[PDB]
Curated annotation (Swiss-Prot), chain A:
Protein name: Helicase loader
Annotated family: Belongs to the phage P protein family.
Full-sequence portion shown in this chain: 119 to 232 of 233
This protein's encoding gene: P
Assembly and oligomerization: Forms a (host) DnaB(6):lambda P(5) complex in the presence of ssDNA.
Originating species: Escherichia phage lambda
Function, in words: Loads (host) replicative DNA helicase DnaB onto single-stranded (ss)DNA at the origin of replication. Reconfigures the DnaB hexameric ring, generating an opening large enough to permit ssDNA into the central channel. Necessary for the bidirectional replication of lambda DNA. It interacts with the ori (origin of replication) region of the genome during the initiation of replication.
Curated annotation (Swiss-Prot), chain C:
Induction statement: Slightly induced by hydroxyurea.
Function of the molecule: The main replicative DNA helicase, it participates in initiation and elongation during chromosome replication. Travels ahead of the DNA replisome, separating dsDNA into templates for DNA synthesis. A processive ATP-dependent 5'-3' DNA helicase that acts on preformed replication forks (have single-stranded (ss)DNA tails). ATP is the best nucleotide for helicase activity; GTP, CTP, dCTP and dATP are poor substitutes. Participates with DNA primase DnaG in primer RNA (pRNA) synthesis during initiation of DNA replication. Has DNA-dependent ATPase activity.
Domain of life of the native organism: Bacteria
This protein's domain notes: Loader protein DnaC alters the inter-domain and inter-subunit interactions of DnaB, inducing an open ring conformation that allows ssDNA to access the interior of the DnaB(6)DnaC(6) ring.
Segments crossing the lipid bilayer: none
Protein name in UniProt: Replicative DNA helicase DnaB
Cystine bridges: none
Residues annotated as binding ATP: R65
Originating species: Escherichia coli (strain K12)
Subunit structure, interactors included: Homohexamer ring. The helix loader is a DnaB(6):DnaC(6) complex with a cracked opening large enough to allow ssDNA into the central cavity. Component of the replication restart primosome, which is composed of PriA, PriB, PriC, DnaB and DnaT; DnaC is required to load the helicase on the replication fork DNA while DnaG primase associates transiently with this complex. Interacts with PriC alone and in the DnaB-DnaC complex, probably 1:1 binding with PriC.
Sequence similarity: Belongs to the helicase family. DnaB subfamily.
Included stretch of the parent chain: 378 to 468 of 471
Amino acid sequence: GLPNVSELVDMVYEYCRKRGLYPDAESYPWKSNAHYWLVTNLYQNMRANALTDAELRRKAADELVHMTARINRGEAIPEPVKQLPVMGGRPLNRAQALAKIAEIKAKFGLKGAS
Amino acid sequence: GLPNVSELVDMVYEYCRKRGLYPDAESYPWKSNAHYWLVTNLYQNMRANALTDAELRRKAADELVHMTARINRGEAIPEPVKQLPVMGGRPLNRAQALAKIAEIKAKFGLKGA
Amino acid sequence: PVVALSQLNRSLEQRADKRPVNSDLRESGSIEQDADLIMFIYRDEVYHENSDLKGIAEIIIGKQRNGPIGTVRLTFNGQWSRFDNYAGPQY
């Protein structure tokens, strides 16, 4: 079930404290997508508006009411957007790099590096 | 039926995000005329007053109440406002344009052109 | 053509909508007066983590002297540090 106002505020504070070790908000181990959306929206709003504790609680209550209304009316929550893979696959060594350097210098010669 | 305050705010934000490519507001795929009027009015009010989220919701609720009062008393909503046709139909090739330019030059005798 | 980069005041970050406008060139009215073309770069993902436009940037023509004005969408590949033509649906 959806957390109450106090629980939502506590979760937002915990996410704010713990976000330092996550490369992105999607990497956070959210209990559900709705919790992710609500907590991130509250964090962004309070960071961009310098809200107080009472204002933060009021915004959390409004977001909870909106989420409950949307759930009662249906709708579907997608899986964010994501941003780029991690890539990899670099089986390169120093000798091959030096060979590339020598080939480039031989092809050009005008490097002028000493 | 008319959307609630939250749905109206969501539609207004979506229109604000996605109107950067449409030629005009009337070209937006509005569900109904009332939705177009309400969303556009809220967007313009936010643009001209820098309304916050709570202020936007309050304005949306006020507009919904006003629209409901207007509907209950009757009145017919006209189809947007419209602005000019699309024109078109220009099947002109480079050769004909160059011939016309040369004819203009010959007729007016432009020394510098 | 001369393309000169400029900066905007901090107050822009306090507005409800952070897309730049001409009045955001505060302390630099002569720049708005003299410039023939003014383009603002806006990336929604910078301000919003949950943006649906990740990798998408907007070039907003705030002042076009000899033509229309509006927004042009491009794809931002920060991995390669590049801008590319936007291949998504256009409205």
